[PDB]
């Protein structure tokens, strides 16, 4: 009956910066609760948790991959192959974490979403980890990602633009991640730049804090970077 201990044991895991265990202290939260209306606290802990775990992998990935490019530039197959197989371990890890959150998000989190902002957050979250898959995948899984991502982000956008105010953090955060999805994954800078400014402008006319302020700055930084070379 007391699932509040896992909320407490995850705050410790965060504080001690042991993120893979915080995920486990939060996997229990969703399951022991059964199918209940999940709170603002536990959601952010789950968000922070999986994001930090994945973040640590993607950081490792993007470094390893960039070392591999400076090695293909010299054509050292005996060096590149060992780099790639090590990347194979990281890519395998990444797959499992995404294949852990998504169906858990599918099973107990998306169906039990009540308010307007709750549905946007979880759908944006679904679109996120699907996009995280698209970063490294190649085959039929890669196409399925970009598809599942596009559908999830647009599904979230419809609720976000209508049900929530232009200055609401997640409405911009979704727009920010949606904006990267086009540029990074779909290789089309055009539709990316358009959505980026559009979400920015509507938030500006509204302005008239803290979390919202920061995201707008990321949008502006991306535009100035997407119009450089």
């Amino acid at each position: 009956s007391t699932r509040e201990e896992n909320v407490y044991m995850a705050k410790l895991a965060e504080q001690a910066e042991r993120y893979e265990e915080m995920v486990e202290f939060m996997e229990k939260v969703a399951k022991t609760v059964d199918v209940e209306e999940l709170t603002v606290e536990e959601r952010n802990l789950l968000s922070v948790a999986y994001k930090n775990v994945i973040g640590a992998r993607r950081a490792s990935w993007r470094i390893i991959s960039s070392i591999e490019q400076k090695e293909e530039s010299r054509g050292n197959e005996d060096h590149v192959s060992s780099i790639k197989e090590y990347r194979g371990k990281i890519e395998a890890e990444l797959s499992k974490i995404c294949d852990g959150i998504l169906n858990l998000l599918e099973s107990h989190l998306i169906p039990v979403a009540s308010t307007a902002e709750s549905k946007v957050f979880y759908l944006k979250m679904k679109g996120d980890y699907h996009r995280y898959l698209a970063e490294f995948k190649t085959g039929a899984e890669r196409k399925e990602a970009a598809e599942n991502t596009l559908l999830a982000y647009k599904s979230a956008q419809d609720i976000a633009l209508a049900e929530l105010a232009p200055t609401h953090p997640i409405r911009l955060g979704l727009a920010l991640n949606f904006s990267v999805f086009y540029y990074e994954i779909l290789n089309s800078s055009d539709r990316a730049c358009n959505l980026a400014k559009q979400a920015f402008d509507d938030a500006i006319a509204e302005l008239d804090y803290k979390d919202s302020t920061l995201i707008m700055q990321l949008l502006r930084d991306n535009l100035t970077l997407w119009t450089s070379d």
Partner: protein
Amino acid sequence: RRELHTLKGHVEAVVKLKGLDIETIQQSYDI
């Protein structure tokens, strides 16, 4: 706060701190 909240910031913080002379990876800001 950029190296504290985004992947792009943390990546560029680590790559500069380790003295790795490899060419800068293309990346965008995301949460």
